A paper describes a structure:
The structure of ClpC on its own was solved at 8.4 Å resolution using ~90.000 collected particles. Attempts of 3D classification and refinement using the existing ClpC-MecA structures failed to give a refined map, indicating that on its own, ClpC assumes a substantially different conformation. Indeed, reconstructions revealed that ClpC without MecA assembles into an oligomeric assembly made of two open spirals that interact via head-to-head contacts mainly mediated by the MDs. The AAA+ domains are staggered with a rise of ~20 Å per subunit. N-domains domains are packed between MDs and are displaced so that they lie on top of the adjacent small AAA1 subdomain. The MDs coiled-coils constitute the backbone of the spiral and mediate the spiral head-to-head contacts, which involve residues F436, R443 and D444 providing a structural rationale for the activated states of respective MD mutants. The MD-MD head-to-head interaction stops the formation of virtually infinite spirals as in the Hsp104 crystal arrangements allowing the formation of a compact, repressed ClpC reservoir. ATP addition caused formation of larger ClpC assemblies that eluted prior to ClpB hexamers and a 670 kDa standard protein, suggesting formation of ClpC complexes larger than hexamers. This was confirmed by static light scattering (SLS) measurements, revealing a molecular mass of ≈ 956 kDa corresponding to a decameric complex, consistent with cryoEM analysis. We define this large ClpC assembly as inactive resting state, as it strongly restricts binding of substrates, ClpP and adaptor proteins and does not allow for efficient ATP hydrolysis. As MecA-binding sites in N- and M-domains are not accessible in the resting state, we suggest that ClpC subunit dissociation is prerequisite for MecA binding.
Author numbering: 5 to 69, 80 to 112, 116 to 159, 162 to 247, 255 to 287, 296 to 464, 466 to 536, 539 to 587, ...
The structure:
Amino acid sequence: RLTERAQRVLAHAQEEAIRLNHSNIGTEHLLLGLMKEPEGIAAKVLESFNITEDKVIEEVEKLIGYTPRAKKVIELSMDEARKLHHNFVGTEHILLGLNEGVAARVFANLDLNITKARAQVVKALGNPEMSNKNAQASKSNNTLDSLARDLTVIAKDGTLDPVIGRDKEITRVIEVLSRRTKNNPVLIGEPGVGKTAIAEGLAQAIVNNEVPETLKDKRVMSLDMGTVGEFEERLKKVMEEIQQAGNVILFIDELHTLVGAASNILKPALARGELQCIGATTLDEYRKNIEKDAALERRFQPVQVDEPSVVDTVAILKGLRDRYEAHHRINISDEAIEAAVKLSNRYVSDRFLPDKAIDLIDEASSKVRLKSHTTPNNLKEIEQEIEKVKNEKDAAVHAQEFENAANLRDKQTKLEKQYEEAKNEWKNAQGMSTSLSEEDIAEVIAGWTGIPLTKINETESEKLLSLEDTLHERVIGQKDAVNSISKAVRRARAGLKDPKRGSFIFLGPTGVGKTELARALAESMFGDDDAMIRVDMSEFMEKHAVSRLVGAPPHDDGGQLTEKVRRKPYSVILFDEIEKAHPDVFNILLQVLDDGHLTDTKGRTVDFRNTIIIMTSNVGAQELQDQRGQDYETIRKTMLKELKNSFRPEFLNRVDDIIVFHKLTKEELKEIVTMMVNKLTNRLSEQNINIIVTDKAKDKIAEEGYDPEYGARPLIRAIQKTIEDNLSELILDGNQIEGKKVTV
């Protein structure tokens, strides 16, 4: 039938009949629709000559204080289709149909059909705009108080200060009011980290008035969420007032309203279908609270960026790099910014990097600022010079010294003699200036984590360089397999695997570097081995696939490890004896191997690629006859086949690498025992005691305990069994201690 040009406002002038509830649908539905709001859309050009638009609004709005007269206005409006050389009829020739639509009284809003309206048709384009670019009928074309306090005017002071970077984000925010659905995005995750300062980005657009054509009217107010007998009847009061005033928005500041003094206070007024504002909730509180309603989970749009990304933080950081510089009184060599984002990026597994890196602006800036806080030892030596006798200088006044005389003015002259030097070298020595990286990185995370080693130094031009080397220092051997890994998930790093996507097999007996270099492995990785978690795949069989996958058909025995790592922000996993099982289970252990995570039943989808899992085998004592010195390719290919006997390439094509044991010898026995000596060097020679290494006893007992069954691990205890008891010898000595050395 009709078009988009202001039949828009006749469909919603039929909503103006629903708005204004009148038994004659009046021209003030056409015009109090056509004037959508009391804003100056006065932009109708006829407030020049005779009749004010706002005067029409007031007097016809007192007349209320298609109605076939105005259904003939539909006709006379369609009569204007050929009168002014058009295709179609536009937006204000409704009013050029509005003979009847006048407030014709003593103050008549009688409407000029010609008078200077023809000069106003020399004004309006007319025959250029027939219709339809999509439809080109746009805008200017041819208690009310501290209960809702704001920051909008406070930003419009300029006192609130510009954060930067969220152009697309605040753009999204603009798009949310373009919904017909969900007028807030509940920013989830870590809100208010700067996401409150994203709202400062929004009021920042208000003070800019980059805030558009339309949205300059309504404004952000800050809610008062505090306590009073009843708290809430006042709030129900102020609801109808400012909601009736209706030219603002507010926040839920922190909490969705689930309280006792009540929860459903004006949550029914929300449920009245009204009231565009902003809520507040997090990731799992979207998942709890907002989803706990599932009408909250209906009504708002969940959006976040986190406690955020990289160059976002570079943006807002180098933008606020003047503001918080007016706080912390230092300013930046931006390599500190680089290394800061870089390192707390590498670190913080449970909290997030960047508002914690704003907190690094706090810690590091507070650190240089605390070589920069209080009165400035040699200036304090000058203060000792200020600090010999005023605090006892004087009393010769009290009685008859002929002596007041001397020592009085001796120390008058003598101090003031020795004084203004303090001013001179003090104002000189009141340090260097900008916030350098090196030590306001190194010193400060040394104030947090430490050692400018694995905990700080760690540029991976260092450890990726000496990587294979470094772990090969720990448990020697398998260096082929070592940089088969260090190579292998070297190219997990530099992004060349999937960002959510690694498994490594053992070939030997336990604790030969299985326990010990799976140990020393993760202890090299992030400096600490504690991440790594065990199930044998002799253990995960059928209903440890139940206690691996939660029940309801067969209990909450699901996950021997699930709820732990579910709570954890970081872990590493090692599993054992894989083709001790059959090709059937390798699909559920392959379900561990999936997803860029695992799907068990309990809690959360996250990354894989930050750390590693590891596999282990021991069965191939048969192919040790192959070792009894055939190659990597021979025996790895042999138990790559014998591997593949039970295995699945879905499952195996989630495993990275076959990892050998170069079974070990008595020599590697001797040398990991030599590492055990270097342990006691590393711990108990910290009393810095010298060491007799008697190779009689060493190769004696080493010769003894080279276990065919157990390998090396238990013997280590069986070393110390005597040996550290031998230390007790030494402990009960206190004599062959630091600097000296005995054994047999």
